[PDB]
RNA sequence: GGGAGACUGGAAUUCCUGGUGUAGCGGUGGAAUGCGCAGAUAUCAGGAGGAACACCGGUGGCGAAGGCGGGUCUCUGGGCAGUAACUGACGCUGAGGAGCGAAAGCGUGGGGAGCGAACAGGAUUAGAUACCCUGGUAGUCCACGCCGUAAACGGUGGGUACUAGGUGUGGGUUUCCUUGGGAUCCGUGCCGUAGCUAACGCAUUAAGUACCCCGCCUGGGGAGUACGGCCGCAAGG
């Protein structure tokens, strides 16, 4: 999860957003959890 | 690698071309 | 003399000086000004204050003829465009509309070399 | 262009015209008229134009420069012959009427193709057309100087006039020299560029060919006496002793037409460079 | 390059049997026809520099096929040569 | 395909950035505007990269593999711990 | 033969009642040389984007010709030489 | 943008140099051609749209 | 954007003409050589000409390598997939040789807008024959021909069977949904273990595991120089 202080040459799959906001980080983690769950359900 | 050998070759080629430019007229007078 | 209700204005603001020239919708200029004419010279011509002074001088010269509303046409980059627009709008003239009429060469004439300094 | 071999000193770098595009080797007996050399002497018998003397006698090969008549009558080219008095080959027309005439044979004029004069003619190299009907921007040659006066501009080989934008009763022409002239639109013009473009690159090699063409030697004034040329001889190789001046005392100045002539048609002279 | 009829007729004329596509003689005939077409194309456009390389490649393939047929059966090779008018 | 909306993405507050000295000069591919000294992030490129990463994760889980988390700050330790205990996946707090 | 689409922009000063006869007279050459089906679409009196030979609007026309390359080239040449025509654009409809 | 395409996916539309409305819905406000990253289309249809816009500008159907 | 030939158009710079129009314009970290008061700079209309075709335009496409993108028309080379029909070893390399071959330069006839070798001056410096500024001859452009030189770099030759893979991109086909995913073969990317190396780094597009072929080397300068020979109008290789 990158921000204004990340390196695009280092990160390959940039996921912009914000990591300082606790609520934003929690929502992003929930979204990632839902995504991995929808990916697992296919097996 | 480095540029030492390249600079040496450049200097040698430049001196050779200067000598050729200087002796062009004499070479032409001899080869005419 | 003549009378003109409204017209256009052209702001050629290069990296050295700003030339403001007001004209009629036909294309006949009647009042122009610049930093070189207002007093600045050399590098002092490429400044926002000199551009504002030239713009206000042009606005005064146009009001002396009877111009009230102008449509602004700014040119290529250069510090003093917004400053000249503000000076024109504050000297007692209406901005009306603003357009950036900049010549964009589509890879036309080859530009000069690059500065090595 | 055919370059001769360096067999003798007279053929070191000599060249000649390939003579391509020429079908017949003889002219039309009915369109041949006599003409004798003059050696540059006017009616008074005195040598007027220097450097003109012995040369191979030639025929006239009458060429119609007006083409005012035979508008709706087409004509197919028969042969492409050589003309000594001209700089480019000539073309023999076989008019559908029955008569034959000669043309300057512009570039790209093959044998068998048909041309058609008149106002309703198509824009193609070879046929005549009035400037009023010729669209602006095309290329023409040997058009005229006055209505029905005859072709007088761009008649040499490889040269051509550029018809710029016309306006009113006048059309603008750019000459091969670069001059911008104006001519009344009522003038008949020939479309296409003159043929024999390879001309002007022939190396004569020796003085024999120029002497056969009728060009005598030319003596420079520096090697003459003060009584013959302003560039006095002196004692040694002199550079002239003064500014360059004609043998009759005329300096290398404008020497143009008299002041205030009937030159209202010209709008821009040529450039010196 | 070649249409579906001008090529089908050449195949039927220079083939070994019915529905014979790719035989030595048929391939050589097709390569010769393409070589003539490319030679005319180059005579029209004498500064291609790519059609010339293609022509050289096709000529190399034709030479390889000719060598193969000559090493296999000299009779068929000479027959094809006399029928096509090469060398 | 789209799973999250820009409305929710903006209501959550996932567009703030760092100060002037803590900015990456090479981030010209994602910066859109600078309001009140805060670098604003784009939305369309982010939505596209989200789908790209979704496809990547789908292919990864199809081939066989889970996602492992990591964290060191003292502001989301319990959050990540609960998420991990719920989803059955690695985590470090 | 091959198919081609010719977009013609004529002079706006002319009337709409002389566009079809002119196009027919210009296409008679193809009709007599190669022969093909014709499809004329006249929707002139359209404002142009920029100026063309000191003109504001123009008369657009679309023609479809399944004829030879030489035929379409001669037609384009005649249209360009004509004075009433202002612009011509020939496109290939089969593949290109 | 972010969508597959309107031609490579809808498979029910063509690209012609006469569809002034279709070309105006794709070019920018200043008459410039939009980038593929903004239009969200396949490379083939993007090149086709570019060629169509160029033909329109040549036949004087757009203000360049 | 594979090449060749032909036609055609826009932006932009330069020049000229017809209007408006003043005492500055160009230029630099500051300053003038330059353009003006003979009407400079600047704006509207018209005309002349030549290079290149903004936006689409990119870790994207093609080509054997150079290299190639305004639009239209004629020809043509190369490559991919599917059917899988046809001859059935005809497969790969290649000493000499032949062809193509970045830019620069020369001859012929043109054109030359801008840029711009040399050349003139303005400015700094103790000295500027340069970096900066002002004009500009060859050159950059067209057709016929020439020398065969580049960091022609992927500094990595062409061909064949294999080596966890992960993941964007261009193309042609299939099973599962019914717009989304798996499989199929080639190119183009970036990481990565096994393996290779002195390390950098390569790592299915090898620099790895194996083989056929051509060229090169046995220390740096001398010297890619002299001699003789070959190509070449000349430079030059
Ligand atoms: Mg004489
Ligand atoms: Mg004497
Ligand atoms: Mg005397
Ligand atoms: Mg003496
Ligand atoms: Mg060899
Ligand atoms: Mg060159
Ligand atoms: Mg030259
Ligand atoms: Mg200079
Ligand atoms: Mg040597």
**Who's near D119: CB < 8 A, 6+ residues apart?**
D71, D129, D130, D132, D133
Q: What is the residue extent of each domain of chain E?
A: 1-87
D90 CA to I187 C1', in Å? 61
**Who's near D123: CB < 8 A, 6+ residues apart?**
D129, D134, D135, D138, D191, G81
- Domain membership of residue H7 (yes or no) is no
Structure-block tokens of residue H30: 């200043």
Alpha carbon distance, N-terminus to C-terminus of chain H: 23
- Domain membership of residue H17 (yes or no) is yes
Question: Do chain D and chain A touch with ≥3 beta carbon pairs under 8 Å?
Answer: no
Structure-block tokens of residue G54: 């000191």
- Domain membership of residue H2 (yes or no) is no
**Who's near C93: CB < 8 A, 6+ residues apart?**
C59, C62, C63, C67, C68, C69, C70
SS (H, E, C) chain C: CCCCCEEEEEEEECCCCEEEEEECCCCCEEEEEEHHHHCCCHHHHCCHHHHHHHHHHHHHHHHHHCCCEEEEEECCCCCCHHHHHHHHHHCCCEEEEEEECCCCCCCCCCCCCCCCC
How far apart CA E58 and CA D204 sit, in angstroms, is 47
How far apart CA G74 and CA D124 sit, in angstroms, is 12
Residues of D in contact with G83 (CB under 8 A): 135
Q: Domain span at residue G87?
A: 1-96
Q: Give which of C69, C115, C73 is closest to C92, Cα–Cα.
A: C69
Provide the pairing of β-strand D74-81 with D114-116. antiparallel
How were these coordinates obtained? cryo-EM
E81 CA to I97 C1', in Å? 26
In contact, C60 and C29? CB cutoff 8 Å: no
Provide the pairing of β-strand C69-74 with C6-13. parallel
A42 CA to I131 C1', in Å? 68
Provide the pairing of β-strand D100-103 with D170-174. unpaired
- Domain membership of residue H37 (yes or no) is yes
How far apart CA D54 and CA D43 sit, in angstroms, is 18
Cβ-count burial of D37 within 10 angstroms (0-12 exposed, 13-18 middle, 19+ buried)? middle
Q: Give which of D36, D32, D192, D152 is closest to D102, Cα–Cα.
A: D32
Q: What is the residue extent of each domain of chain D?
A: 1-113, 117-194, 195-273
- Domain membership of residue H52 (yes or no) is yes
How far apart CA D246 and CA D221 sit, in angstroms, is 9
**G12: contact with H, CB 8 A cutoff:** no
CATH number of D195-273: 4.10.950.10
Structural domains of chain C in order of their starting residue, each with its CATH number: 3-117 (3.30.420.80)
Q: Give the H or E element holding residue G42.
A: strand G38-42
How far apart CA B3 and CA D252 sit, in angstroms, is 62
Residues with CB under 5 Å of ion ligand 4 are D 236
Structure-block tokens of residue G47: 């404002």
User: How many structural domains comprise chain H?
Assistant: 1
> Which residues of C spanning 30-49 put their CB closer than 7 angstroms to strand I?
30, 32, 34-37, 41-46
CATH code at position H61: 4.10.640.10
Structure-block tokens of residue D211: 């002497």
Residue D50 CA, ligand 1 centroid: distance in Å: 6
Q: Which nucleotide is nearest to H57 (CA to C1')?
A: I10
User: Burial code of G14-49, b = ≥16 C-beta within 10 A, e = fewer?
Assistant: eeeeebeebbeebbeebeeeeebeeeeebebeeebe
In contact, C102 and C89? CB cutoff 8 Å: no
User: How many structural domains comprise chain G?
Assistant: 1
F61 CA to I162 C1', in Å? 28
Angle between helix E51-72 and E24-44 (nearest 10)? 160
Contact G48 H62 (CB under 8 A): no
Please state which CATH class domain D1-113 belongs to: mainly beta
Structure-block tokens of residue E12: 């039927």
Chain I nucleotides close to protein (CB under 7 A) are 1-5, 7-13, 16, 19-32, 40-58, 60, 63-65, 70-78, 85-87, 89-91, 99-101, 108-109, 111, 113-116, 131-133, 143-145, 151, 155, 165-171, 179-182, 189-190, 220-226, 234-236
- Domain membership of residue H45 (yes or no) is yes
Angstrom resolution of this structure:
3.2
Residues of F in contact with A15 (CB under 8 A): 46, 49-50, 53
Collapsing DSSP states into helix, strand and coil, what is residue G82? coil
Cβ of C65 near strand I (under 7 Å)? The reply is: no
SS (H, E, C) chain D: CEECCCCCHHHCCCEECCCCCCCCCCCCHHHCCCCCCCCCECCCCCECCCCCCCCCCCCCCCCCCCCCCCCCCEEEEEEEECCCCCCCCEEEEEECCCCEEEECCECCCCCCCEEECCCCCCCCCCCEEECCCCCCCCEEECCCCCCCCCCCCCCCCCCCEEECCCECCEEEEECCCCCEEEEECCCEEEECCECCCCCCCCCCCCHHHHHHHCCCCCCCHHHCCCCCCCCCCCCCCCCCCCCCECCCCCECCCCCCCCCCCCCCCCECCCCC
How far apart CA D57 and CA D36 sit, in angstroms, is 7
- Domain membership of residue H6 (yes or no) is no
Q: In angstroms, what CA-CA distances link C38 with C49, D21, G3?
A: 11, 73, 68
CA D115 to chain CA mean position, Å: 22
Pick among 1.10.287.10, 3.40.50.720, 3.40.50.11540, 3.30.750.80: CATH of E1-87: 1.10.287.10
């Amino acid at each position: 999860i990158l921000d204004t202080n990340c390196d695009p040459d280092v990160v390959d799959y940039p996921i912009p957003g914000n990591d300082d906001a606790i609520r934003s980080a929690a929502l992003l983690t929930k979204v990632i959890a839902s995504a991995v769950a929808e990916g697992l359900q296919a097996r | 690698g480095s540029v030492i050998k390249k600079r040496r070759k450049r200097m040698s080629k430049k001196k050779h071309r200067k000598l050729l430019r200087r002796t062009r007229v004499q070479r032409r007078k001899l080869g005419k | 003399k003549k009378n003109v209700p409204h017209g256009a204005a052209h702001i050629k603001s290069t990296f050295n000086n700003t030339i403001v020239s007001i004209t009629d919708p036909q294309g006949n200029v009647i009042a122009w000004a610049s930093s070189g004419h207002v007093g600045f010279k050399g590098s002092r011509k490429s400044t926002p204050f000199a551009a504002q002074l030239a713009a206000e001088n042009a606005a005064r010269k146009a009001q002396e003829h009877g111009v009230k509303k102008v449509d602004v046409f700014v040119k290529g980059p250069g510090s003093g465009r917004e400053t000249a627009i503000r000076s024109l709008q504050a000297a007692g003239l209406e901005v009306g509309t603003i357009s950036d009429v900049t010549p964009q060469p589509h890879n036309g004439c080859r530009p000069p070399k690059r500065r090595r300094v | 262009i055919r370059k001769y071999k360096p067999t003798t000193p007279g053929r070191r770098g000599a060249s000649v015209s390939d003579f391509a595009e020429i079908t017949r080797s003889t002219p039309e007996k009915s369109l041949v008229r006599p003409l004798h050399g003059k050696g540059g002497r006017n009616a008074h018998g005195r040598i007027t134009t220097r450097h003109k003397g012995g040369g191979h006698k030639r025929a006239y090969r009458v060429i119609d420069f007006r083409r005012h008549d035979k508008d709706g009558v087409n004509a197919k080219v028969a042969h492409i012959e050589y003309d000594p008095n001209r700089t480019a080959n000539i073309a023999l027309l076989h008019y559908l009427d029955g008569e034959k005439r000669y043309i300057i044979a512009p570039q790209g004029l093959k044998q068998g193709d048909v041309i058609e004069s008149g106002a309703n003619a198509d824009i193609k190299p070879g046929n005549n057309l009035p400037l009023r009907n010729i669209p602006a921007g095309t290329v023409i040659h040997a058009v005229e100087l006055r209505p029905g006066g005859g072709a007088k501009l761009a008649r040499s080989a490889g040269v051509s006039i550029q018809l710029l934008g016309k306006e009113g009763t006048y059309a603008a022409l750019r000459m091969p020299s670069g001059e911008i002239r104006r001519v009344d639109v009522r003038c008949r013009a020939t479309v296409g560029e003159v043929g024999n473009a390879e001309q002007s690159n022939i190396n004569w090699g020796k003085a024999g060919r120029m002497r056969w063409k009728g060009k005598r030697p030319t003596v420079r004034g520096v090697v003459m006496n003060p009584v013959d040329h302003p560039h006095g001889g002196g004692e040694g190789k002199t550079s002239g002793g003064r500014h360059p001046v004609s043998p009759w005392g005329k300096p290398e100045g404008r020497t143009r037409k008299p002041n205030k002539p009937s030159d209202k048609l010209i709008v821009r002279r040529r450039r010196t460079g | 390059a070649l249409t579906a009829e001008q090529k089908k007729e050449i195949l039927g004329q220079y083939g070994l049997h019915d529905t014979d596509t790719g035989s030595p003689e048929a391939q050589v005939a097709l390569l010769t026809k393409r070589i003539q077409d490319l030679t005319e194309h180059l005579k029209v456009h004498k500064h291609d520099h790519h059609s010339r390389r293609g022509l050289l490649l096709l000529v190399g393939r034709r030479r390889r096929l000719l060598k193969y047929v000559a090493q296999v059966d000299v009779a068929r090779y000479r027959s094809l040569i006399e029928r096509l008018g090469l060398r | 395909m789209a799973v999250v909306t820009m409305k929710q993405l903006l209501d959550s507050g996932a567009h703030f950035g760092h100060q002037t000295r803590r900015w990456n000069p090479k981030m010209k591919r994602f910066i859109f505007t600078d309001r009140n000294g805060i670098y604003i992030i784009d939305l369309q490129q982010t939505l596209t990269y989200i789908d790209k990463a979704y496809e990547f994760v789908k292919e990864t889980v199809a081939h066989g593999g889970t996602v492992l988390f990591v964290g060191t700050k003292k502001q989301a330790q319990e959050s990540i711990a609960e998420e991990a205990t719920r989803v059955g996946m690695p985590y470090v707090n | 033969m091959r198919p081609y689409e010719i977009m013609v922009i004529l002079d706006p000063t002319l009337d709409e009642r002389t566009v079809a006869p002119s196009l027919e007279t210009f296409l008679n050459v193809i009709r007599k040389d190669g022969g093909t089906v014709d499809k004329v679409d006249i929707w002139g009196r359209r404002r142009l984007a920029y100026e063309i030979a000191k003109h504001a609007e123009g008369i657009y026309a679309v023609i479809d010709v399944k004829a030879e390359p030489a035929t379409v080239s001669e037609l384009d040449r005649q249209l360009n030489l004509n004075e009433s025509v202002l612009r011509t654009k020939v496109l290939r409809t089969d593949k290109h | 943008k972010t969508r597959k395409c309107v031609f490579c996916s809808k498979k029910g539309q063509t690209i012609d140099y006469k569809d002034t409305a279709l070309l105006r819905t794709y070019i920018s406000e200043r008459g410039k051609i939009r980038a593929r990253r903004v239009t969200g289309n396949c490379v083939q249809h993007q090149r086709d749209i570019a060629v169509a816009v160029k033909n329109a500008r040549e036949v004087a159907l757009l203000p360049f």
